[PDB]
């Protein structure tokens, strides 16, 4: 009977930055997905490889809530199979992900005037990420052939550029507060149903 | 008929001393063997201590023993119960109550044991100051409901009454919740109907007499 | 010093027969008493010593004393009966009471009727955001209240005040009382409780907007 605590996902006051972004396991509880597509709130509804009518009605053994926060123009790579500084450094989609992508803007609420750069991305990295691969690293990353010992200098940078948020900026550099499900299906009997199964 | 009416209990801070006082009126008090028990908020009765026919036969109770005495005047018809070394676990209402059955106290057997007429709530508070409430509106929004909200007041007895109590069907007052600040939390509500929300006015008098507060407040819709 | 036993919690409709075994503890006490204790009230000895009930009792009640176990029979139950149940011996000085038996007349189901109440803008100056919903006229009283804000339960956020059960219809009231500040008032936006009674089939949410 207990539902699943969708309403700890997305309407949380804070969220996480996207190079550190959060994940709340999700099992033993009843899917209400209906109130996910029954809104006009959400701006990016994309799910991958599950039905568009059958939502209510699947069954997964588990579902992961990643939610983290980027701007406007960077929902674009939150999608399986794409490049991109978030689709490398950040977040990493597999190519066989199964789950439903959630995005809405949230430029009122994550913007203030001044200022507010409490959130960051990675911006540099030696290597793509794989996927679900949660990365928090904090070395000084080196870009050309000349050696960094950890000087923030003309090619060593801090991997981590911070986000300005401000309420008079274009659209493509909103806070947009990113939620992604992903349905786990395992050798295994299902712990979140729908409620017409 | 037979009265055992009560006064003397308040509010004191641990460690001090407050005497009670029970009266007697009606029956022969020099005859009866008199008892003291108490019980705390919420929990059951628990006894505390037992006096003679004045034939110098105490006999407290454990946990009490050497911090409280029992005396009796009988040529006053009055009983008391004197307090001190106040453990705060005595935070309780006493009742005082009439005694015939017992061995070595009382002379004879003559009626039965404990007719209560109790009262005189006795709170033996912390530190904390006895605070006075904060009366907030409950308004509606559209039977309808409609309430008052007492809250942030540390003793407990306190009363409500809506429009001069001339109103009294419908109306539910609730027992008090405790916070997690030490302090008390109310709330008296009654549902009149739609047909009446801009007709008659509706005010809740809420009455607290050991802090000597007393609110009228009204409540308007939103 | 004994610990005297009773069974509680007892439900039964108008008119009915019921009865209370205290059962006491090492050296078998004779002749106990019975009293009764309304809400607010000093109790009243209902019972003499194990039988023989006094005057002024309405002689629908008695009681059997046989050394180590005792009843309390109620014949006739009445709707201006509800109280709670008190059994006390007295052999040795240091007298003992029961556990109290809560009394609860069987009336036909209520469904409750559940209304909300937002904090006052005068609270808000206090700092302090009261979130008050309301559950009344209902007779069963196993009843459940889960504050839902913004969707999410707040655990440990709420006191809820039952009534004593009602003299005239026989239904339960009870008061839940959610307490915010004004920081975490301000960033949510939609305030409901759940409600979930024996005499109802989905659940009841009765929101509201800031
Ligand atoms: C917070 O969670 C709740 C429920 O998951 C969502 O609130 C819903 O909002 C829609 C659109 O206004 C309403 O039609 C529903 O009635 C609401 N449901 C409840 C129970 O409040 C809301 O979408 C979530 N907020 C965010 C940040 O997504």
């Known amino acids: 009977t207990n539902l699943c605590p969708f309403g700890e996902v997305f309407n949380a006051t804070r969220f996480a930055s996207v190079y550190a972004w959060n994940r709340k396991r999700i099992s033993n509880c009843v899917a209400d997905y209906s109130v996910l597509y029954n809104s006009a709130s959400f701006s990016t509804f994309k799910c991958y490889g599950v039905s568009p009518t059958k939502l209510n009605d699947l069954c997964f053994t588990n579902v992961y809530a990643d939610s983290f926060v980027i701007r406007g123009d960077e929902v674009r790579q939150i999608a399986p199979g794409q490049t991109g500084k978030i689709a490398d450094y950040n977040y990493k989609l597999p190519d066989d992900f199964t789950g439903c992508v959630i995005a809405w803007n949230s430029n009122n609420l994550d913007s203030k005037v001044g200022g507010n750069y409490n959130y960051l991305y990675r911006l540099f990295r030696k290597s793509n990420l794989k996927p679900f691969e949660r990365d928090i690293s904090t070395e000084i990353y080196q870009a050309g052939s000349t050696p960094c010992n950890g000087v923030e200098g003309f090619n060593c940078y801090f991997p981590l550029q911070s986000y300005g948020f401000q309420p008079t900026n274009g659209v493509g550099y909103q806070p947009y507060r990113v939620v992604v499900l992903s349905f786990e299906l395992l050798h295994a009997p299902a712990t979140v149903c729908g409620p017409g199964s | 008929e037979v009265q055992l009416v009560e006064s003397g209990g308040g509010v004191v801070q641990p460690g001090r001393s407050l005497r009670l006082s029970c009266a007697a009126s009606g029956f022969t008090f020099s005859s009866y063997a008199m008892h003291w028990v108490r019980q705390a908020p919420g929990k059951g009765l628990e006894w505390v201590a037992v006096?003679?026919?004045?034939?110098?036969?105490?006999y407290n109770a454990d946990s009490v023993k050497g911090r409280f005495t029992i005396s009796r005047d009988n040529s006053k018809n009055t009983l008391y119960l004197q307090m001190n070394s106040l453990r705060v676990e005595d935070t309780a209402m006493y009742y005082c109550?009439?005694?015939?059955?017992?061995?070595?106290?009382?002379?004879?057997?003559?009626?039965?044991?404990?007719?209560?007429w109790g009262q005189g709530t006795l709170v033996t508070v912390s530190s904390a100051s006895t605070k006075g409430p904060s009366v907030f509106p409950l308004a509606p929004s559209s039977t309808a409901a409609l309430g008052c909200l007492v809250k942030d007041y540390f003793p407990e007895p306190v009363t409500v009454s809506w429009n001069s109590g001339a109103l009294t069907s419908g109306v539910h007052t609730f027992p008090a919740v405790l916070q997690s600040s030490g302090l008390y939390s109310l709330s008296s509500v009654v549902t009149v109907p739609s047909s009446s929300l801009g007709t008659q006015t509706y005010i809740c008098n809420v009455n607290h007499k050991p802090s000597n507060t007393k609110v009228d407040k009204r409540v308007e819709p939103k | 010093i004994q610990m005297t036993q009773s069974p509680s919690s007892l439900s039964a409709s108008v008119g009915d027969r019921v009865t209370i075994t205290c059962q006491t503890s090492?050296?078998?006490?004779?002749?106990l008493n019975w009293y009764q204790q309304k809400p607010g009230k000093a109790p009243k000895l209902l019972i003499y010593?194990?039988?023989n009930l006094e005057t002024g009792v309405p002689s629908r009640f008695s009681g059997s004393g046989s050394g180590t176990d005792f009843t309390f029979t109620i014949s006739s139950l009445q709707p201006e009966d509800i109280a709670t149940y008190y059994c006390?011996?007295?052999?040795?000085?240091?007298?003992?009471f029961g556990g109290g038996t809560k009394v609860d007349i069987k009336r036909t189901v209520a469904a409750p009727s559940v209304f909300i109440f937002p904090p006052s803008d005068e609270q808000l100056k206090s700092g302090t955001a009261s979130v008050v919903c309301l559950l009344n006229n209902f007779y069963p009283r196993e009843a459940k209240v889960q504050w839902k804000v913004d969707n999410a339960l707040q655990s440990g956020n709420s006191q809820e005040s039952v009534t004593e059960q009602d003299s005239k219809d026989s239904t339960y009231s009870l008061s839940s009382t959610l307490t915010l500040s004004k920081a975490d008032y301000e960033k949510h936006k939609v305030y409901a409780c759940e409600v979930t009674h024996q005499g109802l089939s989905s659940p009841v949410t009765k929101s509201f907007n800031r």
């Open positions: 006096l003679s026919y004045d034939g110098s036969n105490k």
């Open positions: 010593d194990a039988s």
């Open positions: 006390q011996q007295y052999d040795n000085l240091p007298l003992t």
């Open positions: 090492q050296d078998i006490s004779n002749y």
């Open positions: 109550a009439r005694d015939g059955v017992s061995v070595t106290m009382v002379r004879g057997v003559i009626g039965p044991l404990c007719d209560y």
